[PDB]
Amino acid sequence: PQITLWQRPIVTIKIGGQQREALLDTGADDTVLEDINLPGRWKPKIIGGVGGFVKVRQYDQVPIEICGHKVIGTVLVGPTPANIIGRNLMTQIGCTLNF
């Protein structure tokens, strides 16, 4: 499918057996979600963006389904004004930019 950008490219994802909404974000290296609790061990991490940096939890090898794909990747959990699906996952689902 094709997604035009006149609106935010929001998609539904499934992680931890629950559904959430997230933004397909080509400007994001990593995936950051704020409204979920993930199980197990994690690594502290710091990411930076417009406005400054913030501390988040890095969960590795997290199973997640986006669009119609079931992939595994790193998911950062922490403060963010919007759930973001980064390139680390967009590449695995075959999402590309075209013009």
Add this chain to the structure above:
Amino acid sequence: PQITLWQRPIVTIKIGGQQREALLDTGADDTVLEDINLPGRWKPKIIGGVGGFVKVRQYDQVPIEICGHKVIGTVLVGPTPANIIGRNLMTQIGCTLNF
């Protein structure tokens, strides 16, 4: 043309008669550039992202060339760790997400 996401989708832009590099960012509503000086009047604006908000200058009706397309749009000038091309401009150059 197609752009796969295994690397940051950086493109060359021309604005104010000068060449710069910026990130095609589907997760950005607006376009924010840090390494340029734009002529004329502007309106103060505040945008928020991961890490918090920041004050920037809003320049309207700015001619900008990207991916061989010559368009006009709003460009924000202020602190940002990366130059970002937002949806306000990606839509005008016909950039879409496909998977």
